[PDB]
Design a protein around this ligand. Sequence first.
Ligand SMILES: OC[C@H]1O[C@H](O[C@H]2[C@H](O)[C@@H](O)[C@@H](O[C@H]3[C@H](O)[C@@H](O)[C@@H](O[C@H]4[C@H](O)[C@@H](O)[C@@H](O[C@H]5[C@H](O)[C@@H](O)[C@@H](O[C@H]6[C@H](O)[C@@H](O)[C@H](O)O[C@@H]6CO)O[C@@H]5CO)O[C@@H]4CO)O[C@@H]3CO)O[C@@H]2CO)[C@H](O)[C@@H](O)[C@@H]1O
Ligand SMILES: OC[C@H]1O[C@H](O[C@H]2[C@H](O)[C@@H](O)[C@@H](O[C@H]3[C@H](O)[C@@H](O)[C@@H](O[C@H]4[C@H](O)[C@@H](O)[C@@H](O)O[C@@H]4CO)O[C@@H]3CO)O[C@@H]2CO)[C@H](O)[C@@H](O)[C@@H]1O
Ligand SMILES: OC[C@H]1O[C@H](O[C@H]2[C@H](O)[C@@H](O)[C@@H](O[C@H]3[C@H](O)[C@@H](O)[C@@H](O)O[C@@H]3CO)O[C@@H]2CO)[C@H](O)[C@@H](O)[C@@H]1O
Ligand SMILES: OC[C@H]1O[C@H](O[C@H]2[C@H](O)[C@@H](O)[C@@H](O[C@H]3[C@H](O)[C@@H](O)[C@@H](O)O[C@@H]3CO)O[C@@H]2CO)[C@H](O)[C@@H](O)[C@@H]1O
Ligand code: CA
Ligand code: CA
Ligand code: CA
Length: 686
Amino acid sequence: APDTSVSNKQNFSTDVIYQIFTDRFSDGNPANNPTGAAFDGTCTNLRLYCGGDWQGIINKINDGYLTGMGVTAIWISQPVENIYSIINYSGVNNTAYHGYWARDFKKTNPAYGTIADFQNLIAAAHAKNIKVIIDFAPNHTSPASSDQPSFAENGRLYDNGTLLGGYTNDTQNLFHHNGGTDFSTTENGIYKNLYDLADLNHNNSTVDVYLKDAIKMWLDLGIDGIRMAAVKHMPFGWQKSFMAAVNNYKPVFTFGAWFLGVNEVSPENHKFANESGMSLLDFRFAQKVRQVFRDNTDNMYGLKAMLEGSAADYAQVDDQVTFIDNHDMERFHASNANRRKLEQALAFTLTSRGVPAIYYGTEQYMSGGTDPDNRARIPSFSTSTTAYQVIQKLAPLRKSNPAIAYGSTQERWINNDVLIYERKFGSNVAVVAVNRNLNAPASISGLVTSLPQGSYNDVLGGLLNGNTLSVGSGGAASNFTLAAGGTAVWQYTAATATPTIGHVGPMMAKPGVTITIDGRGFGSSKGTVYFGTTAVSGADITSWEDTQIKVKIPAVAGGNYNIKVANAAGTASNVYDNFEVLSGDQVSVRFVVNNATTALGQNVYLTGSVSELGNWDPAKAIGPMYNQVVYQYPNWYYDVSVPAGKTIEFKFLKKQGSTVTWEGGSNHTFTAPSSGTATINVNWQP
Ligand SMILES: OC[C@H]1O[C@H](O[C@H]2[C@H](O)[C@@H](O)[C@@H](O[C@H]3[C@H](O)[C@@H](O)[C@@H](O[C@H]4[C@H](O)[C@@H](O)[C@@H](O[C@H]5[C@H](O)[C@@H](O)[C@@H](O[C@H]6[C@H](O)[C@@H](O)[C@H](O)O[C@@H]6CO)O[C@@H]5CO)O[C@@H]4CO)O[C@@H]3CO)O[C@@H]2CO)[C@H](O)[C@@H](O)[C@@H]1O
Ligand SMILES: OC[C@H]1O[C@H](O[C@H]2[C@H](O)[C@@H](O)[C@@H](O[C@H]3[C@H](O)[C@@H](O)[C@@H](O[C@H]4[C@H](O)[C@@H](O)[C@@H](O)O[C@@H]4CO)O[C@@H]3CO)O[C@@H]2CO)[C@H](O)[C@@H](O)[C@@H]1O
Ligand SMILES: OC[C@H]1O[C@H](O[C@H]2[C@H](O)[C@@H](O)[C@@H](O[C@H]3[C@H](O)[C@@H](O)[C@@H](O)O[C@@H]3CO)O[C@@H]2CO)[C@H](O)[C@@H](O)[C@@H]1O
Ligand SMILES: OC[C@H]1O[C@H](O[C@H]2[C@H](O)[C@@H](O)[C@@H](O[C@H]3[C@H](O)[C@@H](O)[C@@H](O)O[C@@H]3CO)O[C@@H]2CO)[C@H](O)[C@@H](O)[C@@H]1O
Ligand SMILES: [Ca+2]
Ligand SMILES: [Ca+2]
Ligand SMILES: [Ca+2]
C-alpha cells in the first residue's frame, strides 16, 4: 500500500480532513432523532439536536459531496453515548447534540446511530477512500453538581450499561472534587472541572483501565484517527500512557485540541506535541492565518514568522492539524466580509505543511459568532461555490504532490501583503503565491524557485485570479503581475531517485510494534532501516515499496532514535529524528515528593533510571511538578508514564532555569504496576 492509501492509519499529511459536526451535517435517519424539547428539526435552536446522524454522513459520502470536494478524511463528533438530559442553563435548554457529554464510552450515541450504523459508516468511508477520525473526550463525562445529584445526570459514568459511579457520593474517587478551573494555570485547568464538566480521575485504576479499554473498542471498530478533546485539561503524563496503549495496540493518527489564543506561543504546547505521543491542532497557525487574512491584525511578515517558528518548535510540524476556524470559534467568514479572504485562507492552508482540517460548511461561506452560532446546519450541499472548487482543486494536491504533504516551507518572495512560498520534497516542488491585498496588484520580480525551467499554469485555473508562471534557468521566474487578492499555485512533480523520508508514525512505541515510514525513493526492493546505529532488515521489515515501508521496532533500549533508511543499493536517506522507543508497556504513575521547599522560580522535577524518566538526565527530567490542586507545597506531585512492572530508580531535582540541584541520599526505588495506576509517595532527601 502506498503512503496515500486510505489504509494509512498513521499518516494524514496527504489527506484533507473535513470536520463534521454530526448533528448539524445531515439527518440520514430521522427514526433516531430525539424527541420533544431536546430536538428541533428546523435547527433554529442550536442548543438542541437537529437530527444530524451517521447515516447522513454515509449518504454524503456516497452522493459524492465530500469526494467531489477532494476530501480524504473526516473528523466526526464523539461517537460515545452522551447524556440524555436537557440541561437548563438559566432558562436556556441545552442538549448533548455536540456529543461532548459522554456517559458511556463503550456505547454509542443513539442519536448518531448504532454500533452497526457506525460500522456501516466506516465501511462507506473506506469504500470512498475516506479516513475516519473520531473525537474523544476522556477528560470528563457531563455537567454535574456534587451537592445537586438532581442536576443533569450527576456526571454518572457507565461501562457498557453498568453504572460505575457519579459525581455525588464519589467514595470511589472516579472524579476530581477540586471545583472548577479558571484557566489560571495548567495544573489548575487539569485537576479542576473543565467548566462544570465532571473531571475524571485518571489516577484511578478503574477509570484508567476503562478508558484505555474503551479506546480499544473504537480502535477495533476501524477508526483511522483520534482527535483528543481538552488535551490541556488532562495530566500530560497520563495521556502519554494513553498514547502508549493505543500505539502498542493499534496505532492510529492522533492529535489533541490545545487552544492557543491570539499571539500565544506556548513552549509547553510545543513540548506536549513533541513528547505526548500525539500531535496537536495548529491553533498558532490558525490564529496567525486569521490575523493575516480575516482580521488584518498582522501582515505577511507575521505569517512567515509563524511558519518558520512552528517548523522549528514542532518536532513533527507536518503532524499538526491546521485550520482557519472550528466549532470553538467564530466562523472565518463574516457575512459582510469579502469571500476572497476565506478562499485565500483556504488555498494557503490546503497547500501548507500539516494536516488541513476544514470545518463543515466553510465551503458554503457559513458565517457565525461563538458557539453555538458557529454550529448552524449546513445551508446546502452545493458544489457551485468557489471555496468548494478551491478545495476541490487543491486537496488532491496533498496526494499527487509529496512536496505539499511532506515538503519543506521556504519563503521565496515577500512583502506586507504578498507572500510567495515554496514546498520542496525530493524531485517535487510547489510554489504558492498569495496577494492578500484585495485592492492592489503586486509586481513580482526577482522571484527564484526550485522549479525546473518551464511554463507553469495555475493549478487554480485562475480561479483565485491566478496567473501563469514562467520559469527560466536557475529557477528564475520571469517578472509578472500578481492580481489583487490573487492566488496562484504552480507545481512540479517527478520521480525521486534518492530515498527520502517524509513521514513516520507512530512516533512513540515499544519494540515489536510496527511503525510506518512514508516518503519517496524507497525503491521496490526491500532495503534497510536504521533506528540509530541499529540496522533492521529482512523479516522485521513487513512491507517495503517506493512510498511506504512497514517495519517492526527493534528490541533496543528505551529512548529517542533517528530513523533513516537505505535502498537495496545502500543509498541512505535523510533523517527523521525524534522517534521514541518506549521501555515497554506503559502505566500512569503518580509521583509525590514531600517537604521540597523552594524559592520563586525554583521548580521540582523528577529523574530516573528509565528513558521515561530521562535516564538521570536533568535536561530530560520530568516536570515542573505541581503543588496546588491535588497536593500543596512544599508537597509536589505529577503523573508520569512509566514502563509497567519495571523496577525503577528515581530522584527528585530542584530546577532554576537549567541549573540543577540534585536530591540527597540514595536513589528512590519502586516497581511500576503491571497494569493500572499507582502512587509513589517519598520524602525529599536533603
Ligand atoms: O460550585 C459550582 C460549580 O463550580 C464549577 O462549575 C462552574 C464553572 O467552574 C464555571 O466556569 C461556570 O461554568 C459556566 C461557564 O462559565 C459558561 O461559559 C457556560 O459554558 C458554556 C460554554 O461557554 C459553551 O461554549 C458551551 O460549552 C460546551 C461546548 O458547547 C461543547 O462543545 C463542549 O466543549 C468542548 C469543545 O467544543 C471541544 O473542542 C473540546 O474538545 O472539548 C470541550 C469540552 O468538552 O463542552 C462545553 C462544556 O459543556 O456550553 C456551555 C454551557 O454549559 O456554562 C458553564 C456552566 O454554568 O459555572 C459552573 C457552575 O457554577 C464546578 O466545576 C462545578 O462542579 C460546580 O457545580
Ligand atoms: O503562575 C504560576 C506560577 O507557576 C510557577 O511558579 C512556581 C515557582 O517557580 C516555584 O518556586 C514554586 O513557588 C513556591 C516558592 O518556591 C515558595 O518559596 C513559596 O513562595 C512563597 C514565598 O516564600 C513568599 O515570599 C511569598 O512569595 O509567598 C509565596 C507563596 O507562599 O511557595 C511557592 C508555591 O506557592 O511553585 C510555583 C508553582 O506553584 C512559575 O514559575 C511562575 O512564573 C508562575 O507565577
Ligand atoms: O544576493 C542574493 C540574495 O538572494 C536571496 O534573496 C531573496 C529574498 O530572500 C527573497 O525575499 C526575494 O526577495 C524579494 C523580496 O521578498 C521583495 O520584497 C522584493 O524586494 O523583491 C525581492 C526580489 O527581487 O528574492 C530574493 C532572491 O531574488 C537571499 O535571501 C539574500 O540574502 C541574497 O542577498
Ligand atoms: O549520571 C548517572 C547517575 O545519576 C544520578 O546521580 C546523581 C546523584 O544522585 C546526585 O547526588 C549527584 O551526585 C553528586 C554528589 O551529590 C556529590 O557528593 C559528588 O559525589 O558528586 C556527584 C556528582 O556526580 O549527581 C549525580 C549525577 O550527576 C543517579 O543517582 C545515579 O544512580 C546515576 O548513576
Ligand atoms: Ca437523525
Ligand atoms: Ca481533567
Ligand atoms: Ca523532526
